[PDB]
């Protein structure tokens, strides 16, 4: 139960709906705390195998309203980064300021053909936040990140897709069905512990200085999964001509050799 | 005043013109010192809100002529990296050897349809320089970087654009107008301190191991800009139906919590 | 001489052929040791100036059969990473599981129009290996890496090329000729020491936190090559209207200021 979001779980898929639509879902202190609580709920709910984030009304999110000195956007961004479930943004409308910076830590961005995007910070005399200086170059590459943040231009879904911010474009009526089809295909076919480990190694090894770091972690991951009941279930089911019902859960069966919840310290100098 | 460059400031835009055209603007010791001095001038001139780099004559730059044991190309590359203004390359002609490696630290590459590019080092029995082993993978990605440096092939503007070295292609007469329209749109719409912080965080956080690093810096940046006169000017101007005249300057008003001029030590082992 | 591979050297090009075709070249303990030995041979053979890896029969490689607790895939991946010669994958058929993760450390991926690819780990209750959590984001970028590993979908050559896993697509009969034309153009035109240094700096500086790291190494590399006989041979040959016959070799003439064979320690916690 939230004031700034709707939250629904159906068919193994959580939908978090940004829900201040009279304000084009403008981001507030409470949406920040609530989105952190939404991801705590999705990480803990074994019935959740994928998460869709979308906007109510016309917009996705048009921007921010008006020893934790921490940017609110960043707190959400860092929470999603250490998320254990697939996260898909279904961008239905304007995603401006923190409204676009919030999507960069999500795993897959789908956009309505109506969607608009703008890193408008420099036009307002402020700066890109939500750790977008880290995320944005790893989605669209440095040159595009610099051009969008320098001009602060509001650009089309078509530019978003050509420059690689969004995976694919959908008719307004087709967006959530598309996000759902991806979410359900993961929920149907993949073992939730394997998905959670994959998510964490891909995101975390993007900042690693050498593939040795990945080799050390992914050696321990494949050793642990190799001895798991999920691997056995995968064998049985193929032989017995049936869809696997992976039994191991993100809530209990996450391998203990690595703290999937860990993050470096927030310290000011 | 320079021997190897022209330097002009009009309408908030600096144009640095590589200017040894009888030698296809071949890079020399003096062009190196002069380009460092050109960026010192652009960083210090509050009338400069964007920088265009271009070539005189037929070529952009066809290559190098013939306890600082430092590659000259790198010295320029590292100077641009810690630059505080948007830098756009307008590649008018051949950009060979250090002539292409010099553009990779710039923020946006525009090319004439006449432009040609070649990382020809290995064909001459030498090696890619100007820290291109760091920059080139972050523009075009590792596989393309390897292929261009292995073959040393001189390739077309069209390949440059398809593989992502250049943002866009222009008729020879359209190149500088296009570079100018981008430069003027930044100079017109964005607060110079916000642009300078954005530039530095995007480039610097591309080497950061985790988004926590960006969150720490961009929390301090948004706190500082939040209390700035630029933010106020942005409010006034919207209400009073007028273009903002951001008053804070890169020369004085750069926030002091981070040394924007800092770089790691050059030490030989 | 190998049981799981064919190995041939012609015209300066080594071809390593994955060769358990009755098993769609499934990866085994012995293919792992043999591929390490194949790269030791290619690194030491000055007659080898480029390496092509390809599959026998219908498939490239359909997956794994069935205080070094090290993933076998990773051992190959890490060996290729510290390889000194250009490595091109010619993907002739299905490349599933470790069959696709093995290609990511190679320098250039060419695919037959018949080729298929799938990161199917999560569908089998296991996890992406061969340090693919490091390599895959640096080939196709994080969002695509996440989508392929979450769904475990087997996808077409066309998707592989559009999302940037493969450089180019070839008719089945055209694949090895294309891989050869690239290999021979390197073998013909580039100095082997320059190629080996380039390979190592591009791959290693992709994990470096700042371009200063590249500037330090590439300053020493260009100083050393500047005094080399290859550079002289390059001068003579241009004047004397003839193709250079670079005399310096990867076996003897690798500059000594950096250990090209070095890798960080494999240690379990």
From TrEMBL, chains A, B, C:
EC assignment: the record states 4.2.1.17
What are the TM regions of this chain, as residue ranges? none
Primary enzyme class:
lyase
What would be an example GO MF term here? enoyl-CoA hydratase activity
In terms of InterPro entries, this protein maps to:
ClpP/crotonase-like_dom_sf (IPR029045), ECH/Chromodomain_protein (IPR051053), Enoyl-CoA_hydra/iso (IPR001753), Enoyl-CoA_hydra_C (IPR014748)
The answer on whether this UniProt entry bears the keyword Lyase reads: yes
Recorded hits in Pfam families, A to Z, give: ECH_1
UniProt keyword list? Lyase
Q: Which protein family is named in the record?
A: Belongs to the enoyl-CoA hydratase/isomerase family.
Descriptive protein name: Enoyl-CoA hydratase
Organism per entry: Cupriavidus necator (strain ATCC 17699 / DSM 428 / KCTC 22496 / NCIMB 10442 / H16 / Stanier 337)
